[PDB]
């Protein structure tokens, strides 16, 4: 991300995190206006700026306002960076999240799957950004009740995370809790209780010393 933009990012998110949207929002909109003046609309820095203001709106739960901006950012990024660029998968995942926040889980799912395929096609089927996207897809299938698909995506992500980061990785514990719940939802008690035992024991192990 360009340097003068992330400084603005830090400043605006600081304001947002104090609930001071009356300052965060004008700063983003003016910065967007001034960016457009310098480089015209179809420029990566404009998409980046739109993503910052979409985050601020999301932080206020203005979900449809945020999607409008990211839909604009997505078209910019596809034209300027390409249909398979990682930033396009980033913008697709955020749109999947915003549609899901409006109960529009059937619109969300293609967007999230595309972001997954983009990340596999760039980072390889084993990258942990793929696991992260898998966790995001799993959560969306859960809100549609597709528990066999949830369990598949969580297993894939647990395997990426645990074979590629530590067994003591925050995400490994996070993905194990998610999958454990999903087993219990399905009635697969002995699979659910196998995972729960691991979580407890490893937690006890972490606090205890050598």
UniProtKB/Swiss-Prot annotation:
Where are this protein's TPR repeats?
A: 5-38, 47-80, 89-122, 131-164, 173-206
Regarding tissue, the record states: Found in a variety of tissues. Mostly abundant in brain and spine.
**Where is the protein localized?**
Cell projection, Growth cone; Cytoplasmic vesicle; Cytoplasm, Cytoskeleton
* Function field: Kinesin is a microtubule-associated force-producing protein that may play a role in organelle transport. The light chain may function in coupling of cargo to the heavy chain or in the modulation of its ATPase activity.
Its quaternary structure? Oligomeric complex composed of two heavy chains and two light chains. Interacts with SPAG9. Interacts with ATCAY; may link mitochondria to KLC1 and regulate mitochondria localization into neuron projections. Interacts (via TPR repeats) with TOR1A; the interaction associates TOR1A with the kinesin oligomeric complex. Interacts with BORCS5. Interacts with MAPK8IP3/JIP3 and NTRK2/TRKB; interaction with NTRK2/TRKB is mediated by MAPK8IP3/JIP3.
The record's comment on protein family reads: Belongs to the kinesin light chain family.
**Know the name of this protein?**
Kinesin light chain 1
Q: What is the lineage of its organism?
A: Eukaryota, Metazoa, Chordata, Craniata, Vertebrata
Q: Name the gene.
A: KLC1
């Amino acid at each position: 991300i360009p340097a003068r933009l992330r400084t603005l990012h830090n400043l605006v998110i600081q304001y947002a995190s104090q609930g001071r949207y009356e300052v965060a929002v004008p700063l983003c909109k003016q910065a967007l206006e001034d960016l457009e003046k310098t480089s015209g609309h179809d420029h990566p820095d404009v998409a980046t700026m739109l993503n910052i203001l979409a985050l601020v709106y999301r932080d206020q739960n203005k979900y449809k306002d945020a999607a409008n901006l990211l839909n604009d950012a997505l078209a910019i990024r596809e034209k300027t960076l390409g249909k398979d660029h990682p930033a396009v998968a980033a913008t697709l995942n955020n749109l999947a999240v915003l549609y899901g926040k409006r109960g529009k889980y059937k619109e969300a799912e293609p967007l999230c799957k595309r972001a997954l395929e983009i990340r596999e096609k760039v980072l390889g089927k084993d990258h942990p950004d793929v696991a992260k996207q898998l966790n995001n897809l799993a959560l969306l299938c859960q809100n549609q009740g597709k528990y066999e698909e949830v369990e598949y995506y969580y297993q894939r992500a647990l395997e990426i995370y645990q074979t590629k980061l530590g067994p003591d990785d925050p995400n490994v514990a996070k993905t194990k809790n998610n999958l454990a719940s999903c087993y219990l939802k399905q009635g697969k008690f002995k699979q659910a209780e196998t995972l729960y035992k691991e979580i407890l024991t490893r937690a006890h192990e972490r606090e205890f010393g050598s």
